[PDB]
Design an enzyme around this catalytic site. Sequence first.
Site, mmCIF file in Angstrom:
data_model
loop_
_atom_site.group_PDB
_atom_site.id
_atom_site.type_symbol
_atom_site.label_atom_id
_atom_site.label_comp_id
_atom_site.label_asym_id
_atom_site.label_seq_id
_atom_site.Cartn_x
_atom_site.Cartn_y
_atom_site.Cartn_z
ATOM 1 N N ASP A 43 38.252 37.091 37.642
ATOM 2 C CA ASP A 43 38.104 37.322 36.467
ATOM 3 C C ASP A 43 39.848 37.926 36.550
ATOM 4 O OD1 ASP A 43 37.825 39.547 37.270
ATOM 5 O OD2 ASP A 43 36.892 40.306 35.196
ATOM 6 N N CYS A 46 39.062 41.450 40.592
ATOM 7 C CA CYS A 46 37.663 41.312 41.234
ATOM 8 C C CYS A 46 37.890 42.290 42.657
ATOM 9 C CB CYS A 46 37.457 39.912 41.528
ATOM 10 S SG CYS A 46 38.150 39.322 43.355
ATOM 11 N N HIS A 219 39.744 35.383 46.005
ATOM 12 C CA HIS A 219 38.540 36.214 46.040
ATOM 13 C C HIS A 219 38.638 37.447 46.530
ATOM 14 C CE1 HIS A 219 37.002 33.344 43.338
ATOM 15 N NE2 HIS A 219 35.959 33.744 41.859
HETATM 16 C C1 LIG Z 1 39.844 38.568 42.414
HETATM 17 C C2 LIG Z 1 39.643 37.933 41.337
HETATM 18 O O1 LIG Z 1 39.461 38.462 40.094
HETATM 19 N N1 LIG Z 1 40.205 36.635 41.984
HETATM 20 C C3 LIG Z 1 40.631 35.620 40.528
HETATM 21 C C4 LIG Z 1 41.429 34.505 41.091
HETATM 22 C C5 LIG Z 1 40.599 33.046 41.808
HETATM 23 C C6 LIG Z 1 40.931 31.957 41.601
HETATM 24 C C7 LIG Z 1 42.346 31.684 42.257
HETATM 25 F F1 LIG Z 1 43.056 30.856 42.846
HETATM 26 C C8 LIG Z 1 43.067 33.632 41.649
HETATM 27 C C9 LIG Z 1 44.673 33.221 41.572
HETATM 28 C C10 LIG Z 1 42.055 34.007 40.851
#
Ligand SMILES: *CC(=O)NCc1ccc(F)c(C)c1
Length: 225
Positions: A43, A46, A219
């Site tokens: 979201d 993370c 992620h």
């Molecule tokens: C850590 C986090 O919340 N990552 C979210 C996310 C998952 C996939 C992606 F392509 C992005 C830009 C972000």
Amino acid sequence: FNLISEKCDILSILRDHPENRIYRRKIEELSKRFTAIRKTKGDRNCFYRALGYSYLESLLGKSREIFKFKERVLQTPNDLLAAGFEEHKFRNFFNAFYSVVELVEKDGSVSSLLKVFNDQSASDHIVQFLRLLTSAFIRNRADFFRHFIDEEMDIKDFCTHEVEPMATECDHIQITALSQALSIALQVEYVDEMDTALNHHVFPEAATPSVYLLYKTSHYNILYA
Ligand SMILES: *CC(=O)NCc1ccc(F)c(C)c1
């Protein structure tokens, strides 16, 4: 368990990359060094949510380490004030973080800690606290971050746009800064789809880690040695 999952076997993540040669290779290699994984919701929060949960989990039952961490957390309001944050605006976020630290001390169970981090309200108050402390630590040490990271960067604008807001993604600077702000030693394992070695970075360099994270498809997931 919609924000942080139950523990699973490392090889259970093959199904996220079916019939993929490089991801299968790297996950098999990872399974030789780590036994289990927890997944986090993607979201944009993370990193903060995973580091906060995995570090507090590592403190459970350790009475000296809990005492020392509580002592540090009690001083964090002064970091926020020194960077220009106002007490009446950070109060609700600080109180939520101090509360979960007292849960680690008083309750001491995995199940109670996981329920707080899966409560959208409590969990998001904890993340917002961690983002404000990250921002304060960078702002109070702007010359350090310009000298060692990037002489050309605009520190105040970067914190305003890429640290404080919920859902903003992290880079090396945010990870280094929160590690240093709370004295947490962490190792990040990197799994990408290039035909390269499975590799890792430790924050700070040369420390023995408390926390292990897997960075894969943007992620951060939690690993267990
Ligand atoms: C850590 C986090 O919340 N990552 C979210 C996310 C998952 C996939 C992606 F392509 C992005 C830009 C972000």
